[PDB]
Design an enzyme around this catalytic site. Structure first.
Site, PDB file in Angstrom:
ATOM      1  CG  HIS A   1      -2.086   0.861   1.121  1.00  0.00           C
ATOM      2  ND1 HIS A   1      -3.356   0.576   1.434  1.00  0.00           N
ATOM      3  CD2 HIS A   1      -2.193   2.093   0.470  1.00  0.00           C
ATOM      4  CE1 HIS A   1      -4.099   1.395   1.190  1.00  0.00           C
ATOM      5  NE2 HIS A   1      -3.560   2.583   0.691  1.00  0.00           N
TER       6      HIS A   1
ATOM      7  CG  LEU B   1       5.315   5.167  -6.342  1.00  0.00           C
ATOM      8  CD1 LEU B   1       5.654   4.276  -7.027  1.00  0.00           C
ATOM      9  CD2 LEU B   1       6.470   5.393  -5.235  1.00  0.00           C
TER      10      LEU B   1
ATOM     11  CG  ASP C   1      -2.268   4.854   3.315  1.00  0.00           C
ATOM     12  OD1 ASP C   1      -2.239   5.023   1.964  1.00  0.00           O
ATOM     13  OD2 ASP C   1      -3.403   5.546   3.728  1.00  0.00           O
TER      14      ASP C   1
HETATM   15  N1  LIG Z   1      -3.575   8.050   3.364  1.00  0.00           N
HETATM   16  C1  LIG Z   1      -4.380   9.008   3.377  1.00  0.00           C
HETATM   17  O1  LIG Z   1      -4.572   9.363   4.592  1.00  0.00           O
HETATM   18  N2  LIG Z   1      -5.089   9.511   2.472  1.00  0.00           N
HETATM   19  C2  LIG Z   1      -4.893   8.958   1.053  1.00  0.00           C
HETATM   20  C3  LIG Z   1      -6.060   8.720   0.317  1.00  0.00           C
HETATM   21  C4  LIG Z   1      -7.005   8.131   1.150  1.00  0.00           C
HETATM   22  O2  LIG Z   1      -6.772   6.993   2.184  1.00  0.00           O
HETATM   23  O3  LIG Z   1      -8.540   8.417   1.009  1.00  0.00           O
HETATM   24  C5  LIG Z   1      -3.854   9.772   0.079  1.00  0.00           C
HETATM   25  O4  LIG Z   1      -3.479   9.151  -0.860  1.00  0.00           O
HETATM   26  O5  LIG Z   1      -3.611  11.067   0.239  1.00  0.00           O
HETATM   27 ZN   LIG Z   2      -7.099   4.947   1.447  1.00  0.00          ZN
HETATM   28 ZN   LIG Z   3      -4.331   5.039   0.613  1.00  0.00          ZN
END
Ligand SMILES: NC(=O)N[C@@H](CC(=O)O)C(=O)O
Ligand SMILES: [Zn+2]
Ligand SMILES: [Zn+2]
Ligand SMILES: NC(=O)N[C@@H](CC(=O)O)C(=O)O
Ligand SMILES: [Zn+2]
Ligand SMILES: [Zn+2]
Lengths: 426, 424
Positions: free
Chosen positions: A59, A62, A304
């Site tokens: 996850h 980039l 993430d």
């Molecule tokens: N990790 C996050 O807090 N946000 C994500 C998009 C998302 O999760 O909705 C992003 O790409 O900014």
């Molecule tokens: Zn997300």
């Molecule tokens: Zn995400």
């Protein structure tokens, strides 16, 4: 050329961590055992440091193409290598969205041209993530799409998610879901709890996440499809996944470092660096995510990685965008705040970042086995060091863990033999 | 003042034993064997079952708006005949009981010409259109049983949550017809073997189960009593079982037709086999029986849904959903569940009396000294074919014509007065 890693520690295939050497030859792991002689092959002594399989992050964001200012393919993959990651999976919330042959071909060339680590891109479920028309799953598969998702937003139409899981199950591929019910958001910027009451902000309730997980699990049973839940954050979410698993439904899940470490109580003030989606929820939600990680409900850890520029985060908690950087803080934070605290063993921290994510999505990765591609990372468990945003290779300096003292820092990272990154002192 | 002599009944222990019953001033005066009372009219029942008046929490009386299909009179007279003394009328009428004026008008019609006790439901949203919530506080005051948009599903998740928070504050149930509208697929029957064979559009199981799963979590968050209408899928039972172990206040019902029939029993494209939810797979039907036994499904409710013969003659795609249920309920369940030993006689009685009453907080469904005399006398011996021509309901739409059953009510008392007896 060759390499010979000597006087290092590693996790054996049984479970224990023992001391061995490792021989690399022609971008592949030749030999893994204690005391191995090798002429015409350069030696590298590691002084008891951990020889770990290259970390697998399913996850990642980039940002290129479209948001190259936040992060680029080269900077992110280089920053990923610094965190010990050799294989990452890039999400599809970009401009353009990889929703067709033209866009996925473009994306796959940029990866081939200028990526320091292995990048496996996600295909979108719907075109422009707009949620009204499905992508060509067969075409995207041919061009090496890792899986299908609309990460950033949720699939609001239940019929669309069902149709997507049928198409995905036929092709033997996974549907990966950012679970968010839009009617329940309530314009929130943080968790609906103690913090939202205190500072008079609008909150996102827990049911915003969990109702979609519950929905999708049933759709995934009907489709016979592999379903994977993005960054879990609620006690209810963990329960419904536990229930699904006991019925033998092909469901998996992940959790972030920041969700495994922080909760609403740890937020000192209206600080946009504590603002992500899903938010840092209650004490009981946090305790459930830990309990879920331990009992097998949550399969893996995924960062993430969501980079943003300082000027975007500079404005207030309500206007600032969701997300924090994550590559460079991942292993140190989790070794320090989970492994050294006796919440999980080191064996488990490695597995959650290597062989578990690999096994879930069917990868030949995250294992120091003779025969596999030499994707390795070397980690120093001794040296204490404070996390410093100014010294980050990533262009995203948005983190809440500045000043936090940590051990377990990667010192060298290898990608199919070719060394992509090393720390300044080895 | 009636004295019912030489009958049998379900005691507070569990067994079924001989007894008499004395009624005075519309209340049960004594429940002991060999009673004497010199100035009370004797009624010898000859070993028949003296049951408490049956309770149905899911009913469609059609008035106001649907007079041609059924009326309050005819509907409640059919209820009496079926053994039911308390029924709960659903709010999918025209007009909908969604405000002061409509609810008072409904209560006035009930008061004026109902032969049994009718506890009217209230709508969750105005006109059942799903965009504006009703005034739950006022509807409670005017005698609302619970809140539901039965007929349709509450599609907006925030609306249902808001509704559950509101209903929780007033100690009242949100009762739900679970139907996710994007998953209907223009279906007239179950999506399975029958739809595949006859070239028909089918409603899949997930259409039902995804709403239950959603609502359960919303009900946990709102600390609300949430009740599931006519459960019909394997996965729907599973999610409810999971919720009950977690400690969530969720309850559920099942129909007599979903307990007795499935898709394999539909002989042809016959509109008398068309209801919502539809008759699903063999394994769905098994899971409903399994759920009734393990306590996951709390009760039986008919979902009495009468329509005209001419409306049902239109064909399976255009004909309306629903079958009549009052007059065939106890006969079907006794013959097809109790005779075959799937459940005991204690259980079948409790599923139609003390279970729904306890779940919703009603003093009803128990033969007990001091309680109002809502009683019914049931003949467990005599066999008799189900014949729709003898039905007092305007709704003759049933699939069980010609089925030979035992366990027919012969007399039904409502607060001391005889509302119906077998004129033959
Ligand atoms: N990790 C996050 O807090 N946000 C994500 C998009 C998302 O999760 O909705 C992003 O790409 O900014
Ligand atoms: Zn997300
Ligand atoms: Zn995400
Ligand atoms: N149960 C039915 O088959 N029909 C009901 C309402 C409904 O369930 O849609 C009706 O009012 O006709
Ligand atoms: Zn209904
Ligand atoms: Zn109904």
């Amino acid at each position: 050329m060759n390499y010979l890693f000597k006087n290092g520690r590693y996790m054996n295939e049984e479970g224990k961590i023992v001391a061995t050497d490792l021989l690399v030859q022609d971008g592949k792991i030749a030999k893994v055992a204690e005391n191995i002689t090798a002429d015409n092959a350069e030696v590298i002594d590691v002084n008891g440091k951990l020889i770990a399989p290259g970390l697998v992050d399913v996850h990642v964001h980039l940002r290129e193409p479209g948001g190259e200012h936040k992060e680029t393919i080269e900077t992110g993959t280089l920053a990923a290598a610094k965190g010990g990651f050799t294989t990452i999976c890039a999400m599809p919330n970009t401009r353009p969205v990889p929703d067709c042959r033209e866009h996925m071909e473009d994306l796959q060339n940029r990866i081939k041209e200028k990526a320091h680590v292995n990048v496996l891109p996600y295909g979108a479920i719907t075109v422009r993530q707009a949620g009204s028309e499905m992508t060509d799953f067969e075409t995207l598969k041919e061009l090496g799409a890792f899986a299908f998702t609309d990460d950033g937003v949720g699939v609001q139409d239940a019929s669309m998610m069902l149709a997507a899981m049928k198409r995905a199950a036929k092709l033997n591929m996974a549907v990966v879901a950012h679970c968010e019910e839009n009617t329940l958001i309530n314009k929130g910027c943080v968790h609906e709890g103690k913090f939202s009451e205190k500072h008079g902000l609008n909150g996102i309730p827990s049911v915003c996440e969990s109702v979609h997980i519950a929905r999708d699990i049933l759709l995934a049973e009907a489709a016979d499809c592999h379903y994977h839940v993005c960054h879990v954050s609620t006690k209810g979410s963990v329960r419904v996944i536990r229930d699904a698993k006991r019925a033998g439904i092909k469901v998996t899940a992940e959790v972030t470092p920041h969700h495994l470490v922080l909760c609403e109580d740890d937020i000192p003030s209206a600080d946009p660096n504590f603002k992500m989606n899903p938010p840092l929820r209650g004490k009981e939600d946090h305790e459930a995510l830990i309990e879920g990680l331990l009992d097998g409900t949550i399969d893996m850890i995924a960062t993430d990685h969501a980079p943003h520029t300082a000027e975007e985060k500079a404005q207030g908690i309500e206007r600032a965008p969701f997300g924090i950087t994550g590559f460079e803080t991942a292993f140190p934070l989790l070794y320090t705040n989970l492994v050294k605290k006796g919440i999980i063993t080191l064996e488990q921290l490695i597995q959650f970042l290597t062989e578990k994510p690999a096994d879930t999505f069917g990868l030949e990765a995250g294992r120091l086995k003779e025969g596999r591609t030499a994707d390795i990372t070397i980690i120093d468990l001794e040296q204490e060091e404070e996390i410093d945003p100014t010294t980050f290779l990533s262009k995203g300096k948005n983190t809440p863990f500045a000043g936090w003292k940590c051990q377990g820092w990667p010192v060298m990272t290898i990608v199919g033999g070719k060394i992509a990154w090393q720390k300044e002192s080895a």
